[PDB]
Amino acid sequence: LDPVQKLFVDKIREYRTKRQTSGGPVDAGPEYQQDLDRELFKLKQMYGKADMNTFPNFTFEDPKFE
Amino acid sequence: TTGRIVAVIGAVVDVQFDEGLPPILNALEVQGRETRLVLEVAQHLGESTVRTIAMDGTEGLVRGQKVLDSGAPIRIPVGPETLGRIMNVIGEPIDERGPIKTKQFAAIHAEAPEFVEMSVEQEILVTGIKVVDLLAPYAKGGKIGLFGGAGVGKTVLIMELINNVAKAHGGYSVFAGVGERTREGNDLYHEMIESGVINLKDATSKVALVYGQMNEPPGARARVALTGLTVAEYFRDQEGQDVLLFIDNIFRFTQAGSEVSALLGRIPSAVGYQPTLATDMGTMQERITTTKKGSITSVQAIYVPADDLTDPAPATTFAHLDATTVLSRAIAELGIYPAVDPLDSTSRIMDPNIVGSEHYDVARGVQKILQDYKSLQDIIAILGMDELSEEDKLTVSRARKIQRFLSQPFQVAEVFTGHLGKLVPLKETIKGFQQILAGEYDHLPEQAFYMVGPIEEAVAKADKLA
Amino acid sequence: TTGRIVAVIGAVVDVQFDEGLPPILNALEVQGRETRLVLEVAQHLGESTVRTIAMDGTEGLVRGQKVLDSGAPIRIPVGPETLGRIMNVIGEPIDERGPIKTKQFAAIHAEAPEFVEMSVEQEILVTGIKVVDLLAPYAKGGKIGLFGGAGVGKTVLIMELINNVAKAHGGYSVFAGVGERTREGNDLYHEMIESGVINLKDATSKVALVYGQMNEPPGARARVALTGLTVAEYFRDQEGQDVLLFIDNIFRFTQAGSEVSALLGRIPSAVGYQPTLATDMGTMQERITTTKKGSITSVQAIYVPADDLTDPAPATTFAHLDATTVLSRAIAELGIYPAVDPLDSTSRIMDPNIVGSEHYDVARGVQKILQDYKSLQDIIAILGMDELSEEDKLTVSRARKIQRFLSQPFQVAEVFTGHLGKLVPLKETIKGFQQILAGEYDHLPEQAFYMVGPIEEAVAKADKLAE
Amino acid sequence: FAKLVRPPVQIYGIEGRYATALYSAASKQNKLEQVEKELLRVGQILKEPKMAASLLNPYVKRSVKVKSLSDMTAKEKFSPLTSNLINLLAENGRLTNTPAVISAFSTMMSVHRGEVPCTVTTASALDETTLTELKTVLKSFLSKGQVLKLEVKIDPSIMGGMIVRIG
Amino acid sequence: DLEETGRVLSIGDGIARVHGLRNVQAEEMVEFSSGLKGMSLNLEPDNVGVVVFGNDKLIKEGDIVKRTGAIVDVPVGEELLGRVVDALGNAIDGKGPIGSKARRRVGLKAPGIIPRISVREPMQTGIKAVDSLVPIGRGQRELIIGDRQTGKTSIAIDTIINQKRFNDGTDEKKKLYCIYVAIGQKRSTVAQLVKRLTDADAMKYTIVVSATASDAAPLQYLAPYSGCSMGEYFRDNGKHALIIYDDLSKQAVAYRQMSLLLRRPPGREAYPGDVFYLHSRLLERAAKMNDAFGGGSLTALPVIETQAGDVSAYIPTNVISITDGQIFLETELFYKGIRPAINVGLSVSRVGSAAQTRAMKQVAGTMKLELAQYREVAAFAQFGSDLDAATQQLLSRGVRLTELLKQGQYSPMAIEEQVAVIYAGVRGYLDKLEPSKITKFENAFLSHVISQHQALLGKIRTDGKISEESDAKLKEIVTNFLAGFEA
Amino acid sequence: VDLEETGRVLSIGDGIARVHGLRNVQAEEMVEFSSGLKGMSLNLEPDNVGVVVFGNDKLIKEGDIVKRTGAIVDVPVGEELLGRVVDALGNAIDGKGPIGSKARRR
Amino acid sequence: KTGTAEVSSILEERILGADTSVDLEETGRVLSIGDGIARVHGLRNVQAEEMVEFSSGLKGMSLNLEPDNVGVVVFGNDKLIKEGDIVKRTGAIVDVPVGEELLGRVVDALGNAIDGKGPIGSKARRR
């Protein structure tokens, strides 16, 4: 609506509804989710697969003085 | 909405659509079309008239005849169900195998993705052909243009590429027979079937074939490329794909455009060539990429127009080429399938700054050596190897091993190679030639390297002899 | 009378005059464009509409705008105060020191002076530079076109001439920097300024500069030509003067004409040209002359597109000339400056008479040897040597010495060359080559002959080049 | 020749190159209005085929088409220079084109001083407006009609789309 | 509302015959309905032949044409130093939009004589070969010429990297703000490129005006003018600018094409004639200014990629005649691997001396000439057979020196390094060595000084110039170092 | 009448009949002239029909009634022209009288 | 033609058919002019390739006998003229002075002096 901020309201209460759903704003739904699932997985492909919610730890060694 | 035939001057069909003029690129299916004759809005000439293009044939263009806006550009199947299937331009079984259905159909105008949206940084698609990767590094999302001796198992090779790549890599394939010989595609059809690269039994081939052969009118022939693209983007992004896009033969694109331009009241610039040549080209080129997800890598059969490449068109093309392929009879003659002359298998982006230096160097050593050996082919042609020293003997021999070693047998043309083919990962590949360079296998049989994919099987093979 | 701009399709300004059209060519002042927008009536398009031309550009124009006829064609300041100044078409201070306050005004038009009112047959103006005079002697008051690809030291060369000659010359000069790089003109300016010939203390100089740079909208470049003419004419006749008229570049002028030709709603031409090229030129070149009242030796620099001469425009050009300096891109390309193709740079004006036969002959032998010599050059080029004639060898070499002997470095521009190698007063010139004709020199070097001056010194250099 | 006279609207000429003739012609002699009405008349006096459709029929000889279509008939009271211009458009085949000249014309003594701004719905409605003053508002009030979503929409009139248009 | 609007009179071919808005201020970029701007180039009476920014696919006719009422300007500022924009100075970077929100008419002209000031400048490339043999001063329009990213492009980078030293130095003249007008250069090309420049972080003092191989033709076309407007800002705001136009070949193409599509002819080579004016108008605006302009510069590096070395090629001829020289690069040499690859014979600064750096000049000035001969006998003489040692040496030496003018791409230098390695050859030290070792030498030679003769470098740097003394120190370096360098 | 299934020869240059009418015309229909003579209607312009005239302009003159036949050509086909020299109507010139082919095929 | 006199001024009177009635037949008004091409309205009755005579005095010639106007190559200036200028027929194509007194003479192509030997005599004129 064009007391223009009412079009922000027009949007905004549907943000209010959506964010005042769950996930914050959802209704994006499973189709979004398969899309996510690929790129979120695909990310891991570039990027390695382990402690993306914990700390990775590492190791230190030598072959020989060739 | 409706159009009238208001003027036919050929397939420039002056249509007056009078319920507004839907934006240029909108596909209309003309009503009264037995021969479902799609017109694409090209210009809004005004007068509620558009100039439109038949991408189809005509007659019975009983004037004023009714034309229907599809409300969109031409919509064509997108979705995976195209693989193994041959559709015409207008996305319809010319496999003649009933519906090449998909799930989603797409209006086929869809152009030039944002520079940021690419992984702006692209990466070799591994072919596995030693020579291939080596000499022309093939980029995911890239345009590689295939100049090449005729019928030499261009196709054979290609089929094999599908096998190694579209199989071994997640590579899918699109074959866009743009203006190709319907017949060769027929032949090919059988060949593909035959090769098994296409399969019917299951249509879970890696390739959807799209043909918009000579039979098409230019707009159609021209346009079968966007269509093919439209799918390939589908797979690319959606199926995340590394799509292999065989666009066969781009020249026919150029040709199709160029033709129309004049008539199209467009100055078809130099050489006749459509003034937009580049833009046509560009808009199209920008659709060929590793986006984020997926790459549309364009494997471009490139007819060498007038064998001329300064040839404005090719000049433009150069811009569009990361890696350039000339397939070579010279090589072929050597029984070497690959028939690749490697000197014409480059990527402009060669450098050690770019194509990095062992590869490059080994290669540098190789092009050089082989040539040098070739210098010796002239020299030896006179002096004989007797008058050259072992580093020459060596080089010759190595060159020769290498020579053979580029030969990799073929499952397909067991007729050309003599047998079933292989696959060769790069590390092994470069290592392979590097190894030959180390002269390791003495000059224990070199004909061993003939038609062996990986270098080892030859080393082993040298032994079975020795 | 007033028009309102009715169509602007670029600087082709269509003005529909709402009443009386003054004849074609009236300079109009646009009512609004304070960006002193002279429109020159070009056509009476019909129904009180004229095609007029902006000299200028256009952004901001409201389709509408009122135009008031300046009631004449261009009036320009004339007289001597234009000497030592940069004038544009309108004689504005591109000196940028304020006006070029004259008495006299001018229609930048001027026409061809009567044939009888001309001088009928002129007399040689020697050209100093050995090669040059020798093969192309000029006429005092002559029109010389210097075909040459611009900027190859082409331009340098002209300057150098100016240096030698324009310096050597007294009278006055008119310099038109048309279409050339403002940058070079800037330097040049300062250089003249510096020279003080562009007197920094005379409004005059001895030289007037008129500019119609590339970056301009066409009309300006185009028309500066008439302007420059008007002035020089002013000086020639009125000041009775031996004017030197330097033009760089008529090529850009011609080009300017051609460019418009289309836009002018006319057909362009072959290669796009102005099909009126000839009339334009004929009339223009005939505006040029050395009459009795003065003489304008006009040295007209000619950029020759892609050096194509064949290229109709230059084909035409030739008519206008009576001395052509055809520069060989190849020779230039050999670095060899002199770079000319002199069997293409011509004057019939070389004479056994006028230039005396010695010179003349010496030249004829030269022209000849060389002319033969090229012919082979190619054959032999791939067709190597000897199972042949070595007398030819002698000429070849000789030709080469001579070749080199034409070369003189850009004396002044040590920045470009680092080298000096001087000017050769004519007898010494004749002598020089003649001596080579005497071929005594021949056991000697080759680059001795290269980039020098007086054959004596060259010889000296030969010896020296012989360590 | 003459000198330029052009009633308010005025026009662009071109199929009104004639209009403009009479935008000077009618105007001059100031049977401006005589003809102004003539034209109006003509419009439907025109509109039916006959000796008019005659032209279409290529094969009817323009020569005598004028003497039929305009001889008895278009001079029925359309004459002054009006038949002559008829007979000109006639020659000059601008007869099928004539409506547009009227259109063009007719914004002329009234509508000559029309109303333009492009304004939602049934937008302007060629009238008259005096630019120094507002005239706008008034009009709007008059009505509480038109169609404005179907007719010109909240996207123009107030951006329904724009909020979409930023993203 | 639609208050004063106009209807697209016709559309086809991206040429919008526009009815109305009639009193359009000339070369107003106007706005159509479609968001799309166009600029109302052509005022025909009954319509406006409108060059369309963006493209005609979108378009539907009768559509509202709104004045934008604005004459083409492009944003100007400096926050673009640190940014990639499209030609309209709108981002494409996707970082959101540039802080540069000033706009400036691209409709501007090249200053006069008095405003301008001639060169006497150096302008350092860090490409030895370049600053030496085609010595560079600031303000200059000079042709970069080479054949299909033959490292052509690479060059621009090394220079830019060299300007790093200035912008990362504090330069008051050498602080060259780079404006990279990317013409036609595919998104990949650019994307790629940019990625590097940013890496070169040179992006910070750098505008990238971007016309990739996607643009509407006027856009590609426009891009330089955009750049043109901006660079003059720096120039004139004393700041010292560098513009790379890469390349006008494409721009022109678009432009001709644009004409052609406008069914306006061209001339020669199918190209219209005042494309000369195009480049002139464009390029003359690159200049070296007087002090009124803060003295600054817009140094113009147009790039034209020869097509098949062809330059007689009208438009190349044009550009060549405008440029005060060309750097032609010997592409086969590039391909021989020779990077730089130069066709130095075909690389000229007619200028020469106003554009050089004394440090270098002291070895290089002299060298250039000496090389003139080496090269001369590299070419002149040409057999199997030997001459004398002098020349034989010159060839050998020369050849060594040839390596020196190479520079494995993306590795420019500050003046002393260049001079340093050069000293080694000029002054006879490495005639000796071989190419294989030259390259090695240099590496070592640099680490040697890097470590050690930092003093000296210090000096050379200081004076901006060599001293015999420094030389004497050098003399020692080379000799000794040379000895270290092998053994 | 028709400017539908007949047309008046709008213009005739010389063998190009711009034909006024015929406006329902198929693309590529062969038409027949009032002179018998066929032509084929390639360009259906609203205003004319560019008709390639299978005849000459000395054989007629304008406004002429051009009638649709309504046909796009087929020519007799069969397999007994074996012997024949024909005109390309798939009808003789052999002067054997007719052909053997009485089926026609596009 | 299809614009001019379909548009006013020119047209604007033809309407009436009052505008000399029309004439311009042994007269012309320069219909449009530019550039030595006087499209001259009228001169209507004309010979072919008639040399015509100008209000600027000058000649031009009516080669192109158009149904409206005359393409007149004006053999010279445009800075004299401004439109509508009256062109008077001569009823006559060029023939040129010929004679034998031209022997001994430099004339312009008009067969008029330029010789500045004063004038020539014209004995004959001849096609």
Curated annotation (Swiss-Prot), chain A:
The record describes its quaternary structure and partners as: Component of the ATP synthase complex composed at least of ATP5F1A/subunit alpha, ATP5F1B/subunit beta, ATP5MC1/subunit c (homooctomer), MT-ATP6/subunit a, MT-ATP8/subunit 8, ATP5ME/subunit e, ATP5MF/subunit f, ATP5MG/subunit g, ATP5MK/subunit k, ATP5MJ/subunit j, ATP5F1C/subunit gamma, ATP5F1D/subunit delta, ATP5F1E/subunit epsilon, ATP5PF/subunit F6, ATP5PB/subunit b, ATP5PD/subunit d, ATP5PO/subunit OSCP.
Q: Which family does it belong to?
A: Belongs to the eukaryotic ATPase subunit F6 family.
Instruction: PTM N6-succinyllysine: list the residues.
Output: K49, K64
* Keywords of the record: Acetylation, CF(0), Hydrogen ion transport, Ion transport, Membrane, Mitochondrion, Mitochondrion inner membrane, Phosphoprotein, Transit peptide, Transport
User: What disulfide bonds does the UniProt entry report for this chain?
Assistant: none
Where does the record say this protein resides? Answer: Mitochondrion; Mitochondrion inner membrane
Major localization listed first in the record, in broad terms: mitochondrion
Which superkingdom? Eukaryota
Spell out the protein name for this chain. ATP synthase peripheral stalk subunit F6, mitochondrial
> What part of the full protein is here?
36 to 101 of 108
One GO term in the molecular function aspect is: proton transmembrane transporter activity
Single GO cellular component term: mitochondrion
Residues with PTM N6-acetyllysine:
K6, K11, K44, K49, K64
List the lineage, top down: Eukaryota, Metazoa, Chordata, Craniata, Vertebrata
List the GO biological process terms. Answer: proton motive force-driven ATP synthesis
Curated annotation (Swiss-Prot), chain B:
Q: Modified residue N6-succinyllysine is at which positions?
A: K66, K103, K201, K206, K464
Name the gene for this chain.
ATP5F1B
Q: How does it sit in the membrane?
A: Peripheral membrane protein
Q: Which residues bind ATP?
A: G151, G153, K154, T155, V156, R181
- Locate the N6-acetyllysine modifications and list their residues: K66, K103, K140, K201, K206, K368, K422, K427, K464
Q: What is its main location?
A: mitochondrion
The EC number(s) this enzyme carries: 7.1.2.2
Q: Please give the name of this protein.
A: ATP synthase F(1) complex catalytic subunit beta, mitochondrial
GO cellular component annotations, sorted alphabetically? Answer: mitochondrial inner membrane; mitochondrion; proton-transporting ATP synthase complex
Keyword annotations:
Acetylation, ATP synthesis, ATP-binding, CF(1), Glycoprotein, Hydrogen ion transport, Ion transport, Magnesium, Membrane, Metal-binding, Mitochondrion, Mitochondrion inner membrane, Nucleotide-binding, Phosphoprotein, Transit peptide, Translocase, Transport
Q: Which family does it belong to?
A: Belongs to the ATPase alpha/beta chains family.
As for what it does, the entry says: Catalytic subunit beta, of the mitochondrial membrane ATP synthase complex (F(1)F(0) ATP synthase or Complex V) that produces ATP from ADP in the presence of a proton gradient across the membrane which is generated by electron transport complexes of the respiratory chain. ATP synthase complex consist of a soluble F(1) head domain - the catalytic core - and a membrane F(1) domain - the membrane proton channel. These two domains are linked by a central stalk rotating inside the F(1) region and a stationary peripheral stalk.
Give the superkingdom in one word: Eukaryota
The organism of origin for this protein: Bos taurus (Bovine)
UniProtKB/Swiss-Prot annotation, chain D:
Q: How is it modified after translation?
A: Acetylation at Lys-139 decreases ATP production. Deacetylated by SIRT3.
Q: An example of a Gene Ontology BP annotation on this entry?
A: proton motive force-driven mitochondrial ATP synthesis
Is Cell cycle given among the entry's keywords? no
Q: Where in the cell is it found?
A: Mitochondrion; Mitochondrion inner membrane
- Assigned GO CC terms: mitochondrial inner membrane; mitochondrion; proton-transporting ATP synthase complex
Q: What does the UniProt keyword field contain?
A: Acetylation, ATP synthesis, Hydrogen ion transport, Ion transport, Membrane, Mitochondrion, Mitochondrion inner membrane, Transit peptide, Transport, Ubl conjugation
Q: Which domain of life is it from?
A: Eukaryota
Positions where N6-acetyllysine occurs in the chain: K31, K37, K47, K50, K77, K135, K139, K149, K153
N6-succinyllysine is found on K67, K77, K135, K139
Query: What quaternary structure, including any partners, is listed in this protein's UniProt entry?
Result: Component of the ATP synthase complex composed at least of ATP5F1A/subunit alpha, ATP5F1B/subunit beta, ATP5MC1/subunit c (homooctomer), MT-ATP6/subunit a, MT-ATP8/subunit 8, ATP5ME/subunit e, ATP5MF/subunit f, ATP5MG/subunit g, ATP5MK/subunit k, ATP5MJ/subunit j, ATP5F1C/subunit gamma, ATP5F1D/subunit delta, ATP5F1E/subunit epsilon, ATP5PF/subunit F6, ATP5PB/subunit b, ATP5PD/subunit d, ATP5PO/subunit OSCP.
Q: Could you say which protein family the record assigns here? A: Belongs to the ATPase delta chain family.
Q: What is this protein called?
A: ATP synthase peripheral stalk subunit OSCP, mitochondrial
What's the name of its gene?
ATP5PO
Curated annotation (Swiss-Prot), chain E:
Write down which residues bear the modification named N6-acetyllysine.
57, 60, 66, 95, 101, 164, 173-174, 195, 239, 361, 368, 432, 440, 465, 473, 475
An example GO CC term for this entry is: mitochondrial inner membrane
Q: Which gene encodes it?
A: ATP5F1A
Q: Where does Mg(2+) bind?
A: T153, D246
Q: What is its main location?
A: mitochondrion
Q: Locate the N6-succinyllysine modifications and list their residues.
A: K95, K101, K164, K173, K195, K239, K361, K432, K440, K465, K473
Instruction: Read off the InterPro entries from this record.
Output: ATP_synth_asu-like_sf, ATP_synth_asu_C, ATP_synth_asu_C_sf, ATP_synth_F1_a_nt-bd_dom, ATP_synth_F1_asu, ATPase_a/bsu_AS, ATPase_F1/V1/A1_a/bsu_N, ATPase_F1/V1/A1_a/bsu_N_sf
Give the sugar-modified residues. S10
Tissue expression as described in the entry: Heart muscle (at protein level). Heart and liver.
Q: How does it assemble?
A: Homotrimer. Component of the ATP synthase complex composed at least of ATP5F1A/subunit alpha, ATP5F1B/subunit beta, ATP5MC1/subunit c (homooctomer), MT-ATP6/subunit a, MT-ATP8/subunit 8, ATP5ME/subunit e, ATP5MF/subunit f, ATP5MG/subunit g, ATP5MK/subunit k, ATP5MJ/subunit j, ATP5F1C/subunit gamma, ATP5F1D/subunit delta, ATP5F1E/subunit epsilon, ATP5PF/subunit F6, ATP5PB/subunit b, ATP5PD/subunit d, ATP5PO/subunit OSCP.
Q: Which domain of life is it from?
A: Eukaryota
Query: What PROSITE patterns does the record point to?
Result: ATPASE_ALPHA_BETA
Q: What protein does this entry describe?
A: ATP synthase F(1) complex subunit alpha, mitochondrial
Write out the GO biological process terms. Answer: proton motive force-driven ATP synthesis
Any keyword rRNA-binding?
Answer: no
What's its membrane topology? Peripheral membrane protein
